[PDB]
Design an enzyme around this catalytic site. Structure first.
Site, PDB file in Angstrom:
ATOM      1  N   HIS A  92       0.830  -1.202   0.000  1.00  0.00           N
ATOM      2  CA  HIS A  92       0.000   0.000   0.000  1.00  0.00           C
ATOM      3  C   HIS A  92       0.859   1.244   0.000  1.00  0.00           C
ATOM      4  O   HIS A  92       0.443   2.304   0.460  1.00  0.00           O
ATOM      5  CB  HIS A  92      -0.927  -0.006   1.215  1.00  0.00           C
ATOM      6  CG  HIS A  92      -2.030  -1.010   1.115  1.00  0.00           C
ATOM      7  ND1 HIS A  92      -3.159  -0.951   1.900  1.00  0.00           N
ATOM      8  CD2 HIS A  92      -2.186  -2.084   0.308  1.00  0.00           C
ATOM      9  CE1 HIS A  92      -3.956  -1.959   1.589  1.00  0.00           C
ATOM     10  NE2 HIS A  92      -3.389  -2.659   0.623  1.00  0.00           N
ATOM     11  N   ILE A 105      -4.297 -11.646  17.664  1.00  0.00           N
ATOM     12  CA  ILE A 105      -5.021 -11.650  18.937  1.00  0.00           C
ATOM     13  C   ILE A 105      -6.411 -12.288  18.818  1.00  0.00           C
ATOM     14  O   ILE A 105      -7.004 -12.660  19.826  1.00  0.00           O
ATOM     15  CB  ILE A 105      -5.142 -10.222  19.543  1.00  0.00           C
ATOM     16  CG1 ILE A 105      -6.011  -9.311  18.670  1.00  0.00           C
ATOM     17  CG2 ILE A 105      -3.745  -9.612  19.742  1.00  0.00           C
ATOM     18  CD1 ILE A 105      -6.206  -7.920  19.246  1.00  0.00           C
ATOM     19  N   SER A 106      -6.919 -12.403  17.591  1.00  0.00           N
ATOM     20  CA  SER A 106      -8.198 -13.048  17.328  1.00  0.00           C
ATOM     21  C   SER A 106      -8.111 -13.927  16.089  1.00  0.00           C
ATOM     22  O   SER A 106      -7.102 -13.920  15.382  1.00  0.00           O
ATOM     23  CB  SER A 106      -9.278 -11.994  17.108  1.00  0.00           C
ATOM     24  OG  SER A 106      -9.289 -11.550  15.764  1.00  0.00           O
ATOM     25  N   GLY A 110      -0.907 -10.213  12.225  1.00  0.00           N
ATOM     26  CA  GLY A 110      -1.707  -9.027  12.531  1.00  0.00           C
ATOM     27  C   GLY A 110      -2.401  -8.429  11.328  1.00  0.00           C
ATOM     28  O   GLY A 110      -2.284  -7.230  11.050  1.00  0.00           O
TER      29      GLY A 110
HETATM   30  N1  LIG Z   1      -1.124  -6.179  18.911  1.00  0.00           N
HETATM   31  C1  LIG Z   1      -1.616  -6.986  17.953  1.00  0.00           C
HETATM   32  N2  LIG Z   1      -0.994  -8.146  17.637  1.00  0.00           N
HETATM   33  C2  LIG Z   1      -1.446  -8.992  16.690  1.00  0.00           C
HETATM   34  N3  LIG Z   1      -2.558  -8.742  15.987  1.00  0.00           N
HETATM   35  C3  LIG Z   1      -3.279  -7.612  16.199  1.00  0.00           C
HETATM   36  C4  LIG Z   1      -2.849  -6.641  17.217  1.00  0.00           C
HETATM   37  N4  LIG Z   1      -3.744  -5.632  17.207  1.00  0.00           N
HETATM   38  C5  LIG Z   1      -4.676  -5.931  16.258  1.00  0.00           C
HETATM   39  N5  LIG Z   1      -4.395  -7.124  15.672  1.00  0.00           N
HETATM   40  C6  LIG Z   1      -5.104  -7.816  14.571  1.00  0.00           C
HETATM   41  O1  LIG Z   1      -4.711  -7.179  13.358  1.00  0.00           O
HETATM   42  C7  LIG Z   1      -5.707  -7.375  12.373  1.00  0.00           C
HETATM   43  C8  LIG Z   1      -5.880  -6.081  11.599  1.00  0.00           C
HETATM   44  O2  LIG Z   1      -6.336  -6.423  10.298  1.00  0.00           O
HETATM   45  P1  LIG Z   1      -6.384  -5.340   9.124  1.00  0.00           P
HETATM   46  O3  LIG Z   1      -6.935  -4.108   9.816  1.00  0.00           O
HETATM   47  O4  LIG Z   1      -7.305  -5.964   8.099  1.00  0.00           O
HETATM   48  O5  LIG Z   1      -4.959  -5.201   8.646  1.00  0.00           O
HETATM   49  C9  LIG Z   1      -6.958  -7.847  13.096  1.00  0.00           C
HETATM   50  O6  LIG Z   1      -7.255  -9.191  12.701  1.00  0.00           O
HETATM   51  C10 LIG Z   1      -6.616  -7.755  14.575  1.00  0.00           C
HETATM   52  O7  LIG Z   1      -7.168  -8.824  15.343  1.00  0.00           O
END
Ligand SMILES: Nc1ncnc2c1ncn2[C@@H]1O[C@H](COP(=O)(O)O)[C@@H](O)[C@H]1O
Ligand SMILES: Nc1ncnc2c1ncn2[C@@H]1O[C@H](COP(=O)(O)O)[C@@H](O)[C@H]1O
Ligand SMILES: Nc1ncnc2c1ncn2[C@@H]1O[C@H](COP(=O)(O)O)[C@@H](O)[C@H]1O
Ligand SMILES: [Zn+2]
Ligand SMILES: [Zn+2]
Ligand SMILES: [Zn+2]
Lengths: 255, 255, 255
Positions: free
Chosen positions: C123, C225-226, C198
């Site tokens: 991006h 985290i999810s 992430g």
């Molecule tokens: N500290 C973190 N470590 C790992 N994953 C994260 C963290 N904060 C947010 N996320 C994940 O990052 C992703 C963001 O996805 P996107 O906004 O599509 O790039 C989501 O699936 C969140 O669950």
């Protein structure tokens, strides 16, 4: 460019009778007789009532996530949405052992409700939502989409985590995922006939799948109340009929 | 990344003289000297006058279909749009038997008007419209695009069926169809030289066609008043010249 | 569809230890602990503060080019943006000879700042701008992005030619260029492990690169985290951990 010859419903039947792996490509034309409005500028369009700039875009959703749920909620509640004969027709064609898959752009899940087994939903589906923070998937149904339901009571519906539920349908500004596109390609690749039913109004995911079909030398049959973008371009035959007139075809192949 | 060496118009001529299947990739740079405004942020842009959010998007069209016709109507009527020397240059290069195709992003149909034979219009063309309900195609011309014409008298122009005519050009939010993209690929695949004339300002369909060209090891020559995205990235040579200075090149190869 | 088995950080370590060419796919999840807001609807999103319709689209930029610079200027100035342990973790994994490339969707350049060598920016990147008329590229830095800088004094920043500087990041309505997409494909093609760290919240360039990875039979490990879109769809394993907990993994493989 090539010659698209118009044929009759009974001519089409004679074509299908010879085939062994039929795939149907379906758009808003297959749902019009179930009172689902279209989403382009076809006069029966949903954009008479709602502004697409605010109600139909991802950036419109990010800022005002309730609005697309108002859309879905109103349609579900205010229109007599039921299966039509075309859907019953297709379902029986699958029962007769000819129709193997349906690739659709429709978000109403009617094909499945008709009793078709393999429905690939290019533009997603109005019966799934996904939390925008934790990605929890919740499967919905008619009852939960009604204006008096608990699910619809506070908009946008909220995930337990505190996040916001997004309907699982493709909005303006989103691309169809590659893997979903491939499932559709893979099905066409091995088909011996492609029915483009009630779609191809304009360049779209569906048009591209028709192009793919030509590249793979597949016989294409267009069923539509009017001519379209693929006519005398990629389609081999055209049947000028409304979707619901497919029962004429199903009845013949039943006997 | 790679080295893009600047050469002269007469050096380019020496390159073309050796080739047998030249393809030209053209954008708004080829039409600027015909007083057609660009459609990005190049200072000579059409978006000084009109809001792109409302006048240039499919969702903007769905809600206010008249607006893009106001745009087309005003440009056709208020600017002295004529062929320039660059177009005559290209046409004669095709007459001399070197230039075989032109893939364009321009919607003005000037290349064709120049007397080129094979013009692939990536972003469609302002001289076709299509009914949004019955898909009737109507071919237009200068005269019908004038502000005093019958066609332009009521906006949006209406199809006999009662539907609404959409100009046959790609708007914001529409993708170029696969089959049109392939026609462009197929032409580049078999070329021995690619002229990127007056385009490649920014990532676009044209940039991707240049990438495709590299992948296929084709010699690329850039002709532009400035450097661009493909310079020292995908182009092999760069000619710093205005489009109309191509007559310098056509004259030499004529003798 | 397939089975995604949850594993532990120490299990992941055991997987990496066996591999020789690890690629990391990273999105906003890797920058959240550096106080960079996300750009979707994840609750920690930047679209609480700004309207995406006006601040984040190319047509929004064409008409009001200052606005995206206000965004960039405010974030750079008002948030304590620094490397987190996850970035140090990755950097040391590259130092240990396992991690070969990072394909990112982030525009913050933090991976590079961490000391990773091969960062592919899907991006784009907030530290380059490009003149919209002459295509001059200017490389920026923290200091020039500050609200008190000369560069930021008049918005939009102006090129010497008189043109307008556009930040070199992908906006709503722009597609990722083919050649950048290929660099990412080419890196995954030759990898033996893919860490989706992430990201993958929603269908995106990243999802498609994961699909590509499956098609090429590559072992995928999700760190998030999810759960996400690729979970029980394309990912082979899932590690439920925050990005910064990767130091747990780096420490083990160091010994
Ligand atoms: N500290 C973190 N470590 C790992 N994953 C994260 C963290 N904060 C947010 N996320 C994940 O990052 C992703 C963001 O996805 P996107 O906004 O599509 O790039 C989501 O699936 C969140 O669950
Ligand atoms: N009852 C119907 N049966 C068959 N085709 C229909 C029907 N109603 C509308 N259509 C067609 O469906 C298409 C809708 O295309 P799209 O909106 O692009 O999916 C148009 O080409 C219409 O002519
Ligand atoms: N008269 C001209 N001759 C050649 N190139 C031009 C001329 N006017 C503008 N350009 C270039 O045309 C390109 C327009 O790119 P785009 O707007 O992306 O199609 C820019 O790179 C300009 O530098
Ligand atoms: Zn949730
Ligand atoms: Zn009509
Ligand atoms: Zn400049």
């Amino acid at each position: 460019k090539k010659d698209t010859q118009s044929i009759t419903l009974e001519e089409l039947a004679k074509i299908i009778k010879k085939c062994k792996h039929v795939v149907a490509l379906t758009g808003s034309g297959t749902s019009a007789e179930s009172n689902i409005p279209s989403f382009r500028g076809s006069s029966n369009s949903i954009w008479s009532k709602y502004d697409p700039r605010i109600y139909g875009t991802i950036w419109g959703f990010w800022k005002y996530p309730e609005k697309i749920w108002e859309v879905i909620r109103d349609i579900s509640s205010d229109y007599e949405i039921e299966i039509n004969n075309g859907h019953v027709a297709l379902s029986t064609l699958e029962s007769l052992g000819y129709l193997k898959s349906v690739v659709t752009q429709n978000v109403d899940g009617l094909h499945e409700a008709s009793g078709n087994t393999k429905v690939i939903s290019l533009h997603g589906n109005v019966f799934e939502a996904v939390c925008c923070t934790c990605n929890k998937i919740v499967k919905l149904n008619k009852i939960m989409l009604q204006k008096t339901s608990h699910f619809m009571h506070q908009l946008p519906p909220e995930c337990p985590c505190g996040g916001i539920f997004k309907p699982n349908i493709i909005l303006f500004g989103e691309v169809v995922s590659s893997d979903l596109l491939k499932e559709a390609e893979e099905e066409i690749a091995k088909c011996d006939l492609l029915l483009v039913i009630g779609t191809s109004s304009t360049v779209s995911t569906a048009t591209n799948l028709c192009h793919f079909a030509c590249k793979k030398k597949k016989k294409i049959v267009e069923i539509n109340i009017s001519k379209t973008y693929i006519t005398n371009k990629m389609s081999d035959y055209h049947v000028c009929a409304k979707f619901s007139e497919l029962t004429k075809v199903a009845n013949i192949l039943k006997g």
